[PDB]
């Protein structure tokens, strides 16, 4: 054989990848997560899983054809979860997605049912993985993945408000003529309608925007900064109406979180985690708060100082999620 | 205003971009080119142009929402070509795309008519740009864009066989257990059915695969390496049959060419250029040959030493393209 | 010729050129950091020591296969610097063991009287990025000699002091420095100002959880973090003889904002006359918006009376030195 | 404490580095390797080792102060090898360096004595490490590291001719007006005076330069391409004469090898390995040949087809290296 005339083999290697990432779901979200991760050189192996055989195979082949331009030596796919074995990070993007005008909370039963099959299959092949939930409603589905997996809470993460906060920083950046990297602001709670903008922490170079404008984010704000939060809430609905779905921004948001996990950065991200014991919350509610994210997942939570109105809005987001969460059939 | 209390302006904002890229067409190919370019930090401004208003705005908005994770501070869109002003590179992806069982050659009348509108509008606003043609049939469309634009031939580049060669290299790599970066091989001629695998130049570490196996690429080959070229030819059709279209690999192949142009690398790529005067070709045929690509586009053409059968196959590819090209009216 | 048998030539100025003046440890660290961040299509090096200059250029050229900067050039002659978008000056006497950066001033001013007109002659529209010490005074000096408008004369200033501060804050908290926010302003030296009022994690003011933060009465003595920021260069000089790596990375950070027109905010040296309560033509670090045209805007930081007094003291210290200087 | 007021700890330590690199020696080569590795984001932890305490601490601190600009969250140092624990790769740059007019082969006795201390201390704390030898004479020192460590051959690599080949490609590129990435050519054998330019493999886009000029690399060559290999041989001495030492190009060459290892790329590099059994070599000689490099080090060797003259020059290099090997006192 030609391979043998050209090359002399020294050993049969173990082959087990050291930085493998699995993406579950090859829809628009899943593929945007896949491309972003490949262009960030985060993994030595990428695995894709879906239920539509043709689409899964087509997507895998199309990424594979770009291998020359990448540094991810192995790209694989299968409907069988054995393809996901030894993943460091498994990203779940599978399930029903919002239609035009549809609340993310409307996807709950359909996605809890899908998660009942997915989660035991992921766990079986990667018992030491970190789970990164992207499927919606993300907060409730992070709780679902946690309960099903049996994993400790540090290893079950939801993409949460990482994108909501990125959108907030982009809009603030556009209003001020400053790059979003130099605009600071936190959107917490549900990744949806009940999210909370933390006006007290909104700043550029550590200068509180609220110290210059005390009415910042209120109805009495002459510049109406609350419309920035309204744009954050409405963004996914506005994008879906225009292009039928969202993909690029969530893909970048997920690869940003994947980078912190894979590279053990210990950067702070507003992501879905259990908030039991914070702000008077007594139940197993999962929603976004600023978390320290690394190789072991969420190791710590930043206790944000909320005004009484900000805390009341966060407890409202918590009540909305727990109302659905507490009555789940699984 | 809050902005003025926070920031003291010391310079009048008369912003002109220095490394602007425009992507014409927001279909799956155009968006894969856009995300790949954004993630490679090649531009300081990205402009998108299309004819479907909603889809165009949705795509622009979705990219802008990922700005925090990028280093391209300005993302814009419009149906109006004034939005593309001062681009250094303009990437053309617009037009009809081949259906399952349809040749890229069959899109020619539809795409020439579209180019008659797009090309003059692009050159009107970006007099310094290089035109990077991606729409199909890419070889005939590069010739068409060249003739319409009034640009010199070095500045009108067709993505051509850069993707066929990357596909070939990936497949060769899979067979050998070597990264595509270390598997060398050139697929030239039409970016389509009549492409030519240059078996004589196929090598690993300077070792000719044809020297070890003389039957390489022929029907007599026991390992059937000709199936690698057949898979290269069939790849877009196979992927279209599986996922409905191709996007990722073409996106990365175009970003690869964009990097060589923007960074003036003078790397060699198999891309569409005028071959009149080479291999006895007498007509104004555009096809892929290894070209040196930099800040002024195609500055030089490498003269590949082809076996008598490889040369005849290349002249056959040229004849096929001329057969379609000679009947065009524009 | 082999080249003509292989290649058919069809077509017989760089667009993103950067020049580094000075091939000392600082200059070479700026050079490697810029090459490894793919910011330039052409890098030029300039120095007065011909052998050292050529050897550094050749050493960089030999790594060309692992880079994406296709032209690396050098000369003692400034004609090599023509068409630079950005010119970084790292040349002159460098900080010595147990000595203030203010002790290099007159010698570096005399050297800039030669360098600056030569840079200006070949790239009249470049952005000048001053790294040489004392950076705040030398930025003012380069501004005066060049005749450039103030937006195009930038000093590396406190970008490194703030980076050191965020690393030290990060080590105490167990958080990546990217998630630890806090600004060190004024002189890139002993009179720098830690802005405790803006120090935060996830928008949470550290002063809100420790009102005494940064003062003598602070039970956790966070003033020691700023003391570590001040002492850092002296400590590194004592141990290894000079500093190079952290400054090269800080300079490449500023070069990225300029070259990619990011409009990110950096604490860098700029003309502060009329701002923050200062009446003289003093340059010091304040948070600036940095892009393709250099410093376009200045962020007006809300400083506490203590912080404002310290910044005024830093301005007074620099003005005092600058006053008694000849050029 | 302020930390406890701001952060709730939820986990539980277990901080084991997953992609750790160690650099032994903090001279100019060791620091150029360190800065290049840091700027390529290859490691989650970087450890430095040396015998000069102040120099080592000052270098560590200077890298640490640049952390905000990096993605390697742990930079450590010590004269104690326990600091290198759990490294995936250990880079050895310690030892005497050659003076002008002094052969790298003259460093043998001083460097072997140093390796007798370093090697057992390195291997002790890192079960999974690959040993990457940079110190000179590199080929002899790779054999020495292999004998002292008791490691299998796949795990002991010498930086060998990776830099000689990069220099060759750079110089070829300069003559042809082509980027080094598109200029192919191998310099094999000893990383020193007896290296072998493989003219038969020298090519652009698969085109053999020797097939265009049969006299290529011989004294009969009108263009004297042999001067390119002479410049490769003399390059370290020319740089040493001008600036006192070489650092940047070797740092980049070592980071290139570290990238193939850390990311399991399976790219081909001309690096020091055992050649017993190839080209009639019957002894345990280490020298550069093209190797497939990945996570388990050198898993495979490319059997380059050499002309009788190239093979004779390669065996001559092996004989020279074997001669020095017979002088080793373990
Ligand atoms: C039992 C099941 N296992 C899977 C696995 C993958 C998918 N795939 C998607 O849901 C892709 C499209 N969805 C979005 N949101 O992109 C569906 C199912 S159902
Ligand atoms: C006169 C015209 N100008 C344009 C500009 C853009 C587009 N957009 C596409 O065709 C994108 C979808 N198609 C593919 N190939 O992705 C069509 C036209 S028609
Ligand atoms: C009239 C003059 N032009 C120059 C240009 C470069 C240099 N080079 C250095 O000073 C490098 C070493 N110094 C530090 N600080 O690294 C000195 C002079 S004097
Ligand atoms: C028993 C010993 N262990 C070590 C470890 C490191 C070093 N360090 C250097 O040799 C740095 C300077 N040399 C080069 N080549 O840069 C020397 C020794 S001696
Ligand atoms: O992936 C491929 O081979 C090519 O992809 C496309 C390139 C440009 C457009 Br517009 C549409 C498809 C092809 O179909 O030629
Ligand atoms: O530039 C080069 O070729 C090489 O550089 C070094 C390699 C290892 C050490 Br330790 C020091 C220098 C060489 O001298 O072999």
Distance from the alpha carbon of residue D160 to the mean position of ligand 4, in angstroms: 19
Alpha helices in chain D (DSSP H): 2-6, 28-39, 53-64, 108-125, 138-149, 162-176, 209-212, 226-243, 248-262, 308-325
Quick one: A18 exposed, middle or buried, by C-beta within 10 A (0-12, 13-18, 19+)?
middle
| φ, ψ for residue B146, nearest 5 deg | -60, -55
Question: Are A304 and C202 within 8 A, CB to CB?
Answer: yes
Cβ of residue B249 closer than 8 Å to a chain D Cβ = no
CB A254 within 8 A of CB A134: yes
Neighbouring CB atoms inside 10 A of A202's CB total 24
Question: Are B267 and D181 within 8 A, CB to CB?
Answer: yes
Which among C36, C295, C11, C46 is positioned nearest to C157, based on CA atoms?
C295
Nearest to D303 among A8, A153, A265 (CB): A8
Closest-CA residue, ligand 5 atom 14, reads: B236
Residue A49's DSSP bridge partners are: A24, A78
CA distance B139 to B193: 12
CA distance D5 to A304: 10
What is the structure's resolution, reported in angstroms to one decimal? 1.9
Does residue A98 have its Cβ closer than 6 Å to ligand 1? no
For chain D, what is the largest distance between any 2 Cα atoms, rounded to a whole number of angstroms?
79
A interface mutation test: which of B10, B68, B217, B246 has the most A CBs within 10 A? B68
Q: Of all atoms in ligand 6, which is nearest to the CA of residue D246?
A: 1
Does residue B117 have its Cβ closer than 6 Å to ligand 2? yes
Which helix H or strand E contains B175, and what residues bound it?
Answer: helix B162-176
How many Å from the N-terminal Cα to the C-terminal Cα in chain C?
Answer: 56
Q: How many CA atoms lie within 13 A of B311 on its CB side?
A: 10
Minimal CA separation from A313 to chain B, in Å: 24
CA angle C32, C38, C40 (to 5 degrees): 90
Minimal CA separation from A318 to chain C, in Å: 20
Given strand C7-9, what is the order of strands in its sheet?
B75-77, B45-49, B20-24, B89-92, B130-133, B156-158, B267-274, B286-294, B297-302, C7-9
In a 3-state reduction of DSSP, which class is residue C201? strand
- Ligand 3 environment, Cβ below 6 A: C 21-27, 47-48, 90-92, 94, 111, 114-115
In a 3-state reduction of DSSP, which class is residue A44? coil
CATH of B15-160, one of 3.40.50.2020, 3.40.50.720, 2.120.10.30, 3.30.360.10: 3.40.50.720
CB A91 within 8 A of CB A132: yes
Cβ of residue B264 closer than 8 Å to a chain C Cβ = yes
Q: Which residues contact B325 (CB under 8 A, 6 or more apart)?
A: B140, B143, B283, B284, B285
In a 3-state reduction of DSSP, which class is residue A134? coil
D50 labelled as ligand-binding?
yes
Distance from the alpha carbon of residue B192 to the mean position of ligand 2, in angstroms: 21
Mutate to test the pocket of ligand 1, among A47, A50, A133 (most ligand atoms within 8 A of CB): A50
What's the CATH class of domain C13-157? alpha beta
Question: Are C5 and B303 within 8 A, CB to CB?
Answer: yes
Nearest to B8 among C14, C262, C298 (CB): C298
CA distance A209 to A225: 10
CA distance C181 to C203: 9
Residue whose token pair is 């705005």: B57
As annotated, the active-site residues of D are 191
Architecture of domain D161-328: Alpha-Beta Complex (3.90)
Question: Are D170 and C238 within 8 A, CB to CB?
Answer: no
Quick one: A214 exposed, middle or buried, by C-beta within 10 A (0-12, 13-18, 19+)?
exposed
Annotated binding residues of B, written as ranges, equal 27-55, 97, 104, 136, 167, 246
Residue B133's DSSP bridge partners are: B92, B158
Distance from the alpha carbon of residue B49 to the mean position of ligand 2, in angstroms: 9
Residue intervals in chain A for CATH 3.40.50.720: 15-160
For the record, the structure tokens of D288 come out as: 């550069």
Nearest to D211 among B184, B212, B305 (CB): B305
Residue B170's DSSP bridge partners are: none
Nearest to D182 among B204, B268, B305 (CB): B268
Neighbouring CB atoms inside 10 A of C79's CB total 10
CA angle A307, A308, A312 (to 5 degrees): 115
Residue intervals in chain A for CATH 3.90.110.10: 161-328
Minimal CA separation from C149 to chain B, in Å: 10
Neighbouring CB atoms inside 10 A of B15's CB total 15
- Cα distances (Å, whole numbers) of residue B246 to A329, B142, B163, D198, D305: 40, 20, 12, 40, 39
CA distance C113 to C141: 9
C interface mutation test: which of A179, A181, A185, A198 has the most C CBs within 10 A? A179
In a 3-state reduction of DSSP, which class is residue B236? helix
Nearest listed ligand to the Cα of residue D133: 6
Residue B269's DSSP bridge partners are: B291
Which residue is closest to C5 within chain B, CA to CA?
Answer: B303
Minimal CA separation from B324 to chain A, in Å: 28
Question: Are A266 and C183 within 8 A, CB to CB?
Answer: no
Closest-CA residue, ligand 5 atom 2, reads: B236
For the record, the structure tokens of A154 come out as: 């540090």
Is the Cα dihedral A267, A268, A274, A276 positive or negative?
A: positive
A38 labelled as ligand-binding?
yes
- Cα distances (Å, whole numbers) of residue D45 to B37, B224, D253: 30, 46, 20
Residue intervals in chain C for CATH 3.90.110.10: 158-325
For the record, the structure tokens of A283 come out as: 């139940």
Q: What is the dihedral of CA C27, D98, D80, D251, to 10 degrees?
A: 40
In a 3-state reduction of DSSP, which class is residue D319? helix
Does residue A302 have its Cβ closer than 6 Å to ligand 1? no
Classify domain C158-325 at the CATH topology level: L-2-Hydroxyisocaproate Dehydrogenase; Chain A, domain 2 (3.90.110)
Cβ of residue B199 closer than 8 Å to a chain D Cβ = no
CA distance A203 to C302: 11
- Cα distances (Å, whole numbers) of residue C83 to C18, C43, D219: 9, 11, 42
Q: Which residues contact B12 (CB under 8 A, 6 or more apart)?
A: none
């Amino acid at each position: 054989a030609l391979k043998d005339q050209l090359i002399v083999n020294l050993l049969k290697e173990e082959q087990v990848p050291q930085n493998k990432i699995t993406v579950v779901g090859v829809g628009a979200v899943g593929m945007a997560c896949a491309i972003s991760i490949l262009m960030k050189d985060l993994a030595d192996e990428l695995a894709l899983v879906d239920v539509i055989e043709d689409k899964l195979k087509g997507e895998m082949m199309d990424l594979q054809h770009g291998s020359l331009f990448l540094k991810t030596p192995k790209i694989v796919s299968s409907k069988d979860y054995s393809v996901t074995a030894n993943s460091k990070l498994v990203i779940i993007t599978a399930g029903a997605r919002q239609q035009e005008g549809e609340s993310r909370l409307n996807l709950v039963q359909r996605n809890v049912n899908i998660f009942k099959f997915i989660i035991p299959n992921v766990v079986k092949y990667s018992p030491q993985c970190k789970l990164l939930i992207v499927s919606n409603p993300v907060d409730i589905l992070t709780y679902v993945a946690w309960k099903i997996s049996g994993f400790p809470k540090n290893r079950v993460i939801g993409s949460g408000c990482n994108l909501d906060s990125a959108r907030f920083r982009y809009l603030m950046g556009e209003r001020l003529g400053v790059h979003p990297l130099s605009c600071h602001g936190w959107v917490l709670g549900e990744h949806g309608d009940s999210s909370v903008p933390v006006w007290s922490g909104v700043n550029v170079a550590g200068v509180s925007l609220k110290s210059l404008n005390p009415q910042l984010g209120t109805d009495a704000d002459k510049e109406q900064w609350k419309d920035v939060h309204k744009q954050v809430v409405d963004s996914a609905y506005e994008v879906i109406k225009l292009k039928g779905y969202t993909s690029w921004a969530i893909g970048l948001s997920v690869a940003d979180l994947a980078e912190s996990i894979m590279k053990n950065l210990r950067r702070v991200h507003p992501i879905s985690t259990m908030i039991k014991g914070l702000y008077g919350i007594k139940e197993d509610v999962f929603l976004s708060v600023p978390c320290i994210l690394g190789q072991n997942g969420i190791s710590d939570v930043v206790k944000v100082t909320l005004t009484p109105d900000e805390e009341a809005r966060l407890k409202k987001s918590a009540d909305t999620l727990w109302g659905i969460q507490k009555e789940l059939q699984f």
